Each structure stands twice: as structure tokens, then as C-alpha cells.
Amino acid sequence: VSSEIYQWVRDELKRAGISQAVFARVAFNRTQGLLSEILRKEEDPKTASQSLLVNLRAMQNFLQLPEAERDRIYQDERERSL
DNA sequence: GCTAATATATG
DNA sequence: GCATATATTAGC
């Protein structure tokens, strides 16, 4: 898992114009508060619980998807929420 | 480790 | 005003 994962998520949130809640759900099937804590702590991927490392690689796996597919998934989750 | 709930912040 | 959003933490 890249040490850059944390800025790649923040850049992706800025770029997509998306909530922590929507990204957290589609990217790694977790809640808004967990992503908020994950982004604040920026814990060294090598120094991370397997639980947390699975989340980061779930996020990295999601972020390596085509921008077009990510943006479509974000829209489904919005209309599925709204 | 994480969730849902709650206290603040934004436009 | 307000909903929507995030930072925070009590509780499972």
C-alpha cells in the first residue's frame, strides 16, 4: 500500500465533489466517522492493523479503477441515498 | 476496530 | 434560517 494513499483520497474527494460518507461506503464499505479518523491519523501503512491495511488497499483498489467508473459509482450511491 | 450518535462547521 | 457535512467520541 502506497504511503501517498491519504493525499490520493483527499485529492479524489476534492476532484469528484463527494462526501466522506459516499466515498467510505463505495470505496471500502465503511462509515463516515472511520474515514474521518483514517484521514486525520495518516498512520504509516507498514504500522497499521491488518483491518486498517485491508481498508487502505480496498481504497487503493477502488482508486485504481477508471475515473469514469468511480464517478458513475459515486452517482449511483448519491441517487441510491437521495 | 468500528459504528452510530452527537457537537460543530459550511454555504 | 436550514440540510448537509465533518470531527469527535461513547459504546458495542
- What are the strands, taking DSSP E only, across A1-82? none
DSSP state of A47: S
Residues 6+ away with beta carbon under 8 Å from A39: A6, A9, A10, A20
Breaks in chain A (C to N > 2.5 A) come right after: none
Cell numbers at A2, concatenated: 502506497
Residue A66's domain is classified under what CATH number? 1.10.260.40
| Structure resolution, Å | 1.8
Sign for the pseudo-dihedral over CA of A47, A25, A71, A39: negative
Question: For residues A14 and A11, what is the distance between their CA atoms, to the nearest angstrom?
Answer: 5
Distance A33 CA to B8 C1' (A): 14
Strand C-contacting residues in A 19-78, CB cut-off 7 angstroms: 19-21, 32-33, 36-37, 39-40
Distance A33 CA to C11 C1' (A): 14
User: How far lies A82's CA from each of A4, A18, A64, A75, in Å?
Assistant: 32, 14, 27, 10
Positions at the binding site of A for DNA: 20, 30-40, 55
What gap in Å lies between CA A13 and CA A56, rounded to an integer? 15
Q: How many domains does chain A have?
A: 1
Instruction: Determine the 3-state secondary structure of A64 from DSSP.
Output: coil
Q: ∠A42-A45-A48 over CA atoms, to 5°?
A: 90
Experimental method: X-ray
Structural domain harbouring A61: 1-82
Contact flag, residue A60 CB and nucleic strand B, below 7 A: no
